[PDB]
From a paper:
In this study, we report a detailed characterization of Φ[name], an icosahedral temperate [name] phage with an inner lipid membrane, isolated earlier from a strain of Flavobacterium (previously Cytophaga). The virion structure determined by cryogenic electron microscopy reveals similarities to members of the viral kingdom Bamfordvirae that currently consists solely of dsDNA viruses with a major capsid protein composed of two upright β-sandwiches. The minimalistic structure of Φ[name] suggests that this phage serves as a model for the last common ancestor between [name] and dsDNA viruses in the Bamfordvirae. Both Φ[name] and the related phage [name] infect Flavobacterium species found in several environments, suggesting that these types of viruses have a global distribution and a shared evolutionary origin.
Earlier, we reported a phylogenetic connection between phage PM2 and the [name] phage [name] (Finnlakevirus [name], Finnlakeviridae), which infects flavobacteria. Structurally, however, the two share the same capsid organization, characterized by the triangulation (T) number pseudo T = 21 dextro. Following the approach applied to the MCPs, we calculated a localized reconstruction of the internal part of Φ[name] spike (penton domain), in addition to the [name] penton base from our previously published data. The resolutions of the localized reconstructions for Φ[name] and [name] were 3.4 and 4.0 Å, respectively. This was sufficient to build the corresponding atomic models de novo. As expected, the structure of the [name] penton revealed a pentamer formed by five copies of protein P12 (encoded by orf12) with the canonical β-sandwich fold, similar to penton base proteins of PM2 and PRD1. This confirmed that the [name] spike is formed by a separate protein forming a pentamer sitting atop the capsid integral penton base.
Numbering used by the authors: -2 to 144
Amino acid sequence: DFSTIPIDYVKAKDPNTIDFCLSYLELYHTTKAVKACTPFSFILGSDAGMQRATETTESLYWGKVILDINPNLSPLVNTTIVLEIESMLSSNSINRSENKRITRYIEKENFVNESSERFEFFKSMELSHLSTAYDVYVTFIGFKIDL
């Protein structure tokens, strides 16, 4: 072997495993010095006691992000929720991180409450916009890649 910490060409061929992620980055994300990766998890929220953005920089996240919005029984303001997510899927072509936003528009009648799981491969997670009436929670279950 005598390669870097990531290991390629392993018989483990499954989309959810970190092996698929490593094999994909070593093949279609050249000019990126991939260092050791570890299974990581973190949570961002809207209420006090949590951070609105990831402190890490120049580190690629791969895994499933769980969006969660619930009502806190508070007066409404008629704003919108915006969660801007970077995207390195097309980073090689343009040498930039694509910006993707997941938005649920808030009505005074449509009393929204839903939770869902999505797959993303991003750099940083930021809650650019927020509504004080609701509760927002995002959880990441995947792997962190150091560059």
